[PDB]
Amino acid sequence: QVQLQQSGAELVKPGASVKMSCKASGYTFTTYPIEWMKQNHGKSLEWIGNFHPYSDDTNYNEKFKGKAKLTVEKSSSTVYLEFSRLTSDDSAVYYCAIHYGSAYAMDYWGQGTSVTVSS
Amino acid sequence: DIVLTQSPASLAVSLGQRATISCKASQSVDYDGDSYMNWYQQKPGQPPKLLIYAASNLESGIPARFSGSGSRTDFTLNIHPVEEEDAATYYCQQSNEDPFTFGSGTKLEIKR
């Protein structure tokens, strides 16, 4: 079996840097690239980028390019999502979903994660 | 980039009646005989389930009632038997050209 047990329920403060962690049990990892989706409040999803453990290649969003550093941890099959300088308007529900089944969309999404801003 | 301007975000559909969630794209999101348009069913407090992928290729898992008719930019989600399980927001994410984006969304509220 496979599952993406991600954790990122922290109360970030304006100008902080919280490092999330999306673990992948029963995963190949290098073969299954992970993508992150940011859902600010109850709005539509916003693809912030993706990652590849085999070649260590990422594709960040032109707006969040550099702000979100995806660290590689093949040893523990976990991809870190280091969100730096998180502004008050960054309260969203992140999801590290991958294209496990079909090669078009993501089937296995994260187990729900949300970062709230104190101000 | 491609803008996924979907149809009426909010609408009511009784049990049995068909729904029509047409996701219009500003740019062509089709490939060599294969469109890259996915639809998700993000239920109230639940990750977006991959209903349809590759435009109209049903995702092995959901019933055979989630059809998808669309070519180039004019896409649609044909849900003839709208049961209570269709109480979620549907989004259309194009994965043809970068950057990948989702649609405005369509909170489908079923009716008893």
């Binding site: 073969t31 993706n50 085999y54 294209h99 | -």
Partner: peptide
């Protein structure tokens, strides 16, 4: 035989390397 699902569009296809 090795195959990986790339992160480059369109979609995440599979490429058999080696």
């Amino acid at each position: 035989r090795k195959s990986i699902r790339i992160q480059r569009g369109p979609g995440r296809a599979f490429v058999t390397i080696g």
